[PDB]
Design a protein around this ligand. Structure first.
Ligand SMILES: NCc1ccccc1-n1cccn1
Ligand SMILES: NCc1ccccc1-n1cccn1
Lengths: 150, 149
């Protein structure tokens, strides 16, 4: 069920890890910088995400988080069906790779306005979610979920 | 108005919980920080505005209203920074009640969370999903979609 499906994506920059959740139907994202991708960090990130949007399904980004006791506990807590993230559809991989490159591009564009990477990454989530493509991802996610409520 | 949010700062366990409340829906986002500083408040608003279409923020106190760093984040993110004076007195009573509701929920999830920050996000989840028959999560999405269309 499309309005509730999200994909986790973990990318690296400046020796740090950027954890992203993409709402697959809209391209809307939330993202955080963490020191490393552990079960505990992923779990807490999912808890935050599910408190903010109606997360029904998550495609986890790798098998360590799919396996992780802590990730499973957060998904049980927040009512999330944890799935694998295998691109049975191959164009999925490319879409995510392209967002990572686009996100890193926006990060380079603001990187000097931000003393800390975390700032630059939240600036990048803002520019990504507001970019008009004519609707933005922030507009599409709202539209998709509102249609689903009604 | 679909773009109006209120900042709210409450204390528990010697730590600070910063809350943004979407006024029309009651939907919230919240974070634990060591201390309410301009830099923390700025970063929190930047995150909030990248996630929801934040047009106006009622700041929670005059230090954040004044803060250069808060004004810079509001300029960067396109937010009109306002004072949070309850020109309607029922506004402050609504925030007090939510801080008490939030603290209650945090109490109820204390067996389950080792760190306060986990309990606070559990409390955000339960607050936003609570049916009152729509939830706050439902109302904000409905409000903002009506706005877009
Ligand atoms: N809808 C959530 C959202 C999130 C991020 C950025 C923008 C938005 N948006 C909605 C209407 C207009 N922008
Ligand atoms: N809409 C954002 C949201 C956030 C938190 C909890 C629930 C929701 N929601 C929307 C539709 C159904 N639940």
């Amino acid at each position: 069920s499309s309005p509730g499906i999200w994909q986790l994506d973990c990318t690296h920059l400046e020796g740090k890890v950027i954890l992203v959740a993409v709402h697959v139907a809209s391209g809307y994202i939330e993202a955080e910088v963490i020191p490393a991708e552990t079960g505990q960090e992923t779990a807490y990130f999912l808890l935050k995400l599910a408190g903010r949007w109606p997360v029904k399904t998550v495609h986890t980004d790798n098998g360590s988080n799919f396996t992780s006791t802590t990730v499973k506990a957060a998904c049980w807590w927040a009512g999330i069906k944890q799935e694998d993230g295998i691109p049975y559809n191959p164009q999925s991989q490319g879409v995510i790779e392209s967002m990572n490159k686009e996100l890193k591009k926006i990060i380079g564009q603001v990187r000097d306005q931000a003393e800390h990477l975390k700032t630059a990454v939240q600036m990048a989530v803002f520019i990504h979610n507001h970019k008009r493509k004519g609707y933005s991802a922030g507009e599409r996610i709202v539209d998709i979920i509102a249609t689903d409520i009604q």
